[PDB]
Amino acid sequence: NYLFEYAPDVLESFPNKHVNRDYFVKFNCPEFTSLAPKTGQPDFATIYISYIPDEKMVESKSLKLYLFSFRNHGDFHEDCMNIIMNDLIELMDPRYIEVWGKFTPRGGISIDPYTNYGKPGTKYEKMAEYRMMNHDLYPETIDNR
Amino acid sequence: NYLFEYAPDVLESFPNKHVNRDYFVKFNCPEFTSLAPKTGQPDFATIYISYIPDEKMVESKSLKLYLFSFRNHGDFHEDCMNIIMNDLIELMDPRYIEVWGKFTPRGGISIDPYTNYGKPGTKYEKMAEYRMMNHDLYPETIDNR
Amino acid sequence: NYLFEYAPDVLESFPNKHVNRDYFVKFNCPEFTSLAPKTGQPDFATIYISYIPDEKMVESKSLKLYLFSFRNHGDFHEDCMNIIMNDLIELMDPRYIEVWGKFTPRGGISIDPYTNYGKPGTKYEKMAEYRMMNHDLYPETIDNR
Amino acid sequence: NYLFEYAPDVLESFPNKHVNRDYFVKFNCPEFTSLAPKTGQPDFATIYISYIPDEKMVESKSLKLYLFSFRNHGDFHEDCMNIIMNDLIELMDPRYIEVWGKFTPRGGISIDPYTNYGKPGTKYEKMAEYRMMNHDLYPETIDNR
Amino acid sequence: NYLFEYAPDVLESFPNKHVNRDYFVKFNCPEFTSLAPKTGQPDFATIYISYIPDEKMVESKSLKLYLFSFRNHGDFHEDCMNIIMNDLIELMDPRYIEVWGKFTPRGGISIDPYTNYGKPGTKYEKMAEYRMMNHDLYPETIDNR
Amino acid sequence: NYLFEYAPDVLESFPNKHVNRDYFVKFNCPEFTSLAPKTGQPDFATIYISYIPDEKMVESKSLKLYLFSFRNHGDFHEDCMNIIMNDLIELMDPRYIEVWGKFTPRGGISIDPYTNYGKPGTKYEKMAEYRMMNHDLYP
Amino acid sequence: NYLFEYAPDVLESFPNKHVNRDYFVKFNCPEFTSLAPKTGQPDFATIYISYIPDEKMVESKSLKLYLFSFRNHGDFHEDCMNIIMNDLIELMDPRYIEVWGKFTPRGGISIDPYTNYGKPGTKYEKMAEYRMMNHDLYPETIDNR
Amino acid sequence: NYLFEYAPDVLESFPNKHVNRDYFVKFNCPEFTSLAPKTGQPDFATIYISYIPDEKMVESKSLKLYLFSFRNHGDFHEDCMNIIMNDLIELMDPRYIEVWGKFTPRGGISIDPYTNYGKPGTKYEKMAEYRMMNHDLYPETIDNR
Amino acid sequence: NYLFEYAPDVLESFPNKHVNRDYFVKFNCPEFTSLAPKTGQPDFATIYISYIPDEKMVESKSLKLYLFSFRNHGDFHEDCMNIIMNDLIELMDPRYIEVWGKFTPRGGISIDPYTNYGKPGTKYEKMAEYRMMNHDLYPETIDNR
Amino acid sequence: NYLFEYAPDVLESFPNKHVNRDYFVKFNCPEFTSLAPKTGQPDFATIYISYIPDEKMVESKSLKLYLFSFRNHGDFHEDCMNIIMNDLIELMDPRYIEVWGKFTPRGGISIDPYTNYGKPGTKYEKMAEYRMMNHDLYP
Numbered sequence A, B, C, D, E, G, H, I: 001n002y003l004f005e006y007a008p009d010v011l012e013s014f015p016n017k018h019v020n021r022d023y024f025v026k027f028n029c030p031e032f033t034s035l036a037p038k039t040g041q042p043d044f045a046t047i048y049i050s051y052i053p054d055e056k057m058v059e060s061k062s063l064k065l066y067l068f069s070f071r072n073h074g075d076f077h078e079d080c081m082n083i084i085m086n087d088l089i090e091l092m093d094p095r096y097i098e099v100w101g102k103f104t105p106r107g108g109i110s111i112d113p114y115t116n117y118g119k120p121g122t123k124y125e126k127m128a129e130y131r132m133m134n135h136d137l138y139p140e141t142i143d144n145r
Numbered sequence F, J: 001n002y003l004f005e006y007a008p009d010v011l012e013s014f015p016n017k018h019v020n021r022d023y024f025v026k027f028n029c030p031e032f033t034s035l036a037p038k039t040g041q042p043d044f045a046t047i048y049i050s051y052i053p054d055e056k057m058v059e060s061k062s063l064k065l066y067l068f069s070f071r072n073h074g075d076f077h078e079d080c081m082n083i084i085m086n087d088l089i090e091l092m093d094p095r096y097i098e099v100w101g102k103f104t105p106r107g108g109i110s111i112d113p114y115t116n117y118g119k120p121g122t123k124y125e126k127m128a129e130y131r132m133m134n135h136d137l138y139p
């Protein structure tokens, strides 16, 4: 039986078997849903989480449990992506991590927050500035269908 | 209800809960529409508004309310896109913001104005320059279908 | 100029120069828009109007003028689509005609009303039955993006 | 505040202003979510409902609230679709109605339950039999990507 | 030096080397342009011409010359497709022939006329009724871009 | 845990709560894999299962395990599809069922096996005759 | 050394291992080229080939070789496609076979000749006739790019 | 009635109400058509014009009429693009402007001429040099389909 | 007989015939499958592999065989992809190589681990670092179907 | 028609009426075909030609014939691209030029040859050095 109340402590990690190398690992999460803060009205999003690990790697079952812990939680989309990133940063202490959320529209408008991070003072911080400044140089076509 | 002539007063905002890191928040607005100043004939576009927030963030519903205010308003597409950015800039005081509108053609011709901005004298101004200089390097294929 | 409340009087037509053979003439109308009866909020759709003419054919510009007349008019999508067909039917007296509208979602739900008609008692009535019975057998994938 | 417990009683309807003709009305519902009856695990699907109205018509907002009521309600997917069709049949007494759920996979296996109904003994009963014998003759490619 | 004044006599044919067999042959003509009758305003279309031949086959250079003969000719789209079909019928006396034109929009609306023919009293006449009644059972998505 | 030996006894059904109407239920199964009839080399397919239930319905997880058990099992194609179809018939005894497997082409050869069943003495048996007839005009 | 004069004597056959069944074997030649018989000018196409064998199968390497023997042969496209089907028919005595060719444009017009066959008297014959009747209902979009 | 003879003098402009910032304005022109100087054969292309405005802005309808003036005007494609850029530079005196033609093939060969310009000695001259050194580093796949 | 216990001793190499050049050789395994080390449960993916050789090349048949030796091996996806790259690195001593894996979802989450390498000290090393920094900027849309 | 023997003498240029500015001109050529270096088997490619003219420009039809002449000609790849590039240099003597050929993979091997030239002693020679550097980070 799962908690639909925000619960960061469900997250787990496992050791990295290839530390001495930089690789990407993406999590496609098309089943994310949470609630709006004022109304309690359900919101929906596909979330892409890509990160380069150091020692600790996020185990996907826990990711799933952590993503399920937002079902009854009423927060804004931009906050949501950012909270998702902070807890993952604290969990793994990764070299680089990015969170890209794509929500379904409300009142004809859809919100896609994009946030990232690079271990401070290193070249991943530089990459994060790079991916950020070159972010969505060509936004994808959307027509709400 | 719904005003249908320019009304930037309807825009509202909320505190940025993650002020200490840069992140993009994009609004896909494919249901936008307004009028042509002289003829009165209507036009339609999809507008992408990406921005890196400082301390204030535009409230979604109010953004919707703001774009409906152009339904009975006559303006050019270029003007229109700059007007939008101005009254987001003034509302939020963002680190960076850009507005890319893609209009449906008249006389077989589509107009896609793109404009952007970064706080004067900060690294966001260099970004605004970068993203503008490298803007639409590979234009997308249009056949008007 | 441009009236923005129901005005079916603006529809015009011209003689069918090829009365002696059946052929479809489709109007892709992706710039359609109107209001919701109670709220006043606006909605958008793409409307496909295919028809087999008899002796009269709707004049394109007037069709445009007719669809602009729904810009400030409150109605439901289903009603709206039937109203359109009625005042094409009455204008042209076609052998067959159908109206398929595809609306942008509200509360996460899109409404695609489809309606059709063939002259009472002719083979076009069998067509109307066929095309309705076999209509949208394989619905298209919608994700609201 | 809402509630996410099965609530068929929240559905509303309005008179069909166009009773004298047959036409289809489809609802694309990509945000459907409910629970597995045992585990308690959330599940997701895209639901397409298409019906031919008699005298009543489901009001989309009521359907919205109705579909949300499944959010914290457990049940297998095949029942789920039947339940949705029954509730609409009682609400509207349609000439015809079909429901096609497309669920996301569990264990790399996805279930797409299709149900339909014709007003008993009328010619729609035969349509239901036709659309069921001819249902999904050429199924879509699914790889779970 | 080519005539841009309607000229059907430019068309040529060659004998069929495989009469005793039914095969399709499609001509994709994305470079078609003509003028509007009232204004002289240029119009544009991609035209697909598919036909099953008998004895005579249309030589493509002549098709090209015939399609170029419309550049200064001011006719309506529906007429245009139909005239294109009649002259091809007279030229070849084919078993079956279809003409599908797709024009670029004017005033936000695009017109796609579809017309066909089967040698009268034969099974191709039946096919023509078939392709007609099953015509565009799923119109393609259009948004004027 | 898991059995990779053919294991039809893993299948499990639950009762159908709606028997007055005919409705389809499709299972998309794109992770099917087994061992080929001779070489011993693996083969892969997406298996599309559609059926009109009668009184019994197949539980998804049970089905998932059932299909895995074919992982280290060796038998020809057509057999492989009917094996499945038949176990599903013996499990549910439905009105109609059809199993279509699309193997990743090994020669220039598709090999997409299509079988179906209609309950004998019924209209479903004519439907099976009907779909099978339409299936091959276009796979 | 190679043969670039039309040479069907190159085709080899082998056993169908699946004589009991009806499976389509598909070949796909993306770079076929011959010559215009009128001038000596080269032409180019993609050739799609599908057939259900009986006893025989064409060994695909001799098919590629066979297709290269057109490099210096003058013939029209319609003729060309039909010739390839005949030579395959004579080599294999297939149950069913079809050849769909897609040529690059010349004079801004591209020719796609489609031809098929089903053993006479069999259901394959009838299978081929259903296919000519429903061949390419929705032609793909071509813009010559 | 129009005329289709080279007419640069038909271009109009309006003051740029937003002089104090840099922004791009692109025109997608898919209906461009003109003539080959010798043969007299029509030719077609999709033209993308993007410019950064200083004090003037081209009026889209004037550009429409301007682009139509090439309809019965002969010229190679590389000149054609230069001519269009020059005429716009004189009209507007832009900070920056680039023009990219994409022509349909002749002899299976298509020419895509790209031209640009920076206000002399200003920093746009350097932008032009940047967008020219970096122009088309990863060219699109073209097969003439 | 086959090997379904992890067996890298299966890989064979051969000569690069193009030692002077830098060409990517691509392999594409659409049906890879292993096992979860946690439970014994099977997992599935498509494996993309690209590498620039030096002296050696992997004989592709032993690559397929090598990939099938994972059928019964327990390991996570990140680990798995990295192992394949290592074994290829040791066999070929490539100039550059990357492995991009795409797993089917489990718990409604799919894992795509991407990893690469460029000979240390060379430009290939730097080539690999540019790629990690610009890897998958726009993630493809995933909806689990 | 037509010559299918290598025939560089078929190339023809016309003067450039705009020499004060640098502009690119690209020729998309997806119907290139020639005979391979050994077997004698044909090979096919789409050839992308981009160049900044100086004073001379290549006439399209002349180019079309030029490329056909490679139809019954035998020579290796890299050679084949430079042959083209060089004849184009000798024809136009442009500021910059690059020829990229994308052959339909014969092994699992692309073979996409990329060459370019910048006029020596100029900034174009640095641009050639620049593009060539960026080309291979992603073909």
Ligand SMILES: N#Cc1c[nH]c2nc(N)[nH]c(=O)c12
Binding pocket: A035, A036, A037, A043, A075, A076, A077, A078, A111, B057, B058, B059, B060, B061
């Ligand atoms: N839930 C919710 C929201 C309601 N208004 C919002 N506005 C913004 N910008 N973001 C949000 O996430 C929401």
Ligand SMILES: N#Cc1c[nH]c2nc(N)[nH]c(=O)c12
Binding pocket: B035, B036, B037, B075, B076, B077, B078, B111, H057, H058, H059, H060, H061
């Ligand atoms: N309405 C209108 C317009 C007419 N000419 C225009 N030209 C430009 N650049 N923009 C516009 O919005 C319009």
Ligand SMILES: N#Cc1c[nH]c2nc(N)[nH]c(=O)c12
Binding pocket: C035, C036, C037, C075, C076, C077, C078, C111, D057, D058, D059, D060, D061
């Ligand atoms: N506006 C509005 C609507 C609110 N409920 C609705 N229900 C239906 N079926 N249609 C509609 O157009 C609307």
Ligand SMILES: N#Cc1c[nH]c2nc(N)[nH]c(=O)c12
Binding pocket: D035, D036, D037, D043, D075, D076, D077, D078, D111, F057, F058, F059, F060, F061
């Ligand atoms: N939830 C859930 C389920 C678990 N097994 C199932 N089996 C079937 N046929 N359907 C279902 O919805 C489920």
Ligand SMILES: N#Cc1c[nH]c2nc(N)[nH]c(=O)c12
Binding pocket: C057, C058, C059, C060, C061, E035, E036, E037, E043, E075, E076, E077, E078, E111
């Ligand atoms: N040209 C032109 C036309 C102007 N109005 C039109 N209306 C229709 N229905 N068709 C047409 O081709 C035209």
Ligand SMILES: N#Cc1c[nH]c2nc(N)[nH]c(=O)c12
Binding pocket: E057, E058, E059, E060, E061, G035, G036, G037, G038, G043, G075, G076, G077, G078, G111
């Ligand atoms: N080559 C060539 C041709 C020149 N005119 C043609 N006309 C047709 N229908 N087909 C062709 O192949 C050719």
Ligand SMILES: N#Cc1c[nH]c2nc(N)[nH]c(=O)c12
Binding pocket: H035, H036, H037, H043, H075, H076, H077, H078, H111, J057, J058, J059, J060, J061
């Ligand atoms: N029209 C025409 C042409 C004929 N040869 C050409 N060569 C070039 N480079 N450009 C052109 O536009 C033409």
Ligand SMILES: N#Cc1c[nH]c2nc(N)[nH]c(=O)c12
Binding pocket: A057, A058, A059, A060, A061, I035, I036, I037, I038, I043, I075, I076, I077, I078, I111
């Ligand atoms: N199998 C398996 C797994 C279970 N949790 C996992 N978490 C991660 N990051 N990767 C994996 O492969 C798995």
Ligand SMILES: [Ca+2]
Binding pocket: A034, A035, A036, A037, A043, A073, A074, A075, A076, A077, A080
């Ligand atoms: Ca939320």
Ligand SMILES: [Ca+2]
Binding pocket: A141, A142, A143, A144, A145, C144, C145
């Ligand atoms: Ca969409």
Ligand SMILES: [Ca+2]
Binding pocket: B034, B035, B036, B037, B043, B073, B074, B075, B076, B077, B080
């Ligand atoms: Ca406007």
Ligand SMILES: [Ca+2]
Binding pocket: B141, B142, B143, B144, B145, E145
């Ligand atoms: Ca388009």
Ligand SMILES: [Ca+2]
Binding pocket: C034, C035, C036, C037, C043, C073, C074, C075, C076, C077, C080
């Ligand atoms: Ca309405």
Ligand SMILES: [Ca+2]
Binding pocket: A145, C141, C142, C143, C144, C145
């Ligand atoms: Ca979509």
Ligand SMILES: [Ca+2]
Binding pocket: D034, D035, D036, D037, D043, D073, D074, D075, D076, D077, D080
């Ligand atoms: Ca459920």
Ligand SMILES: [Ca+2]
Binding pocket: D141, D142, D143, D144, D145, I145
């Ligand atoms: Ca898929």
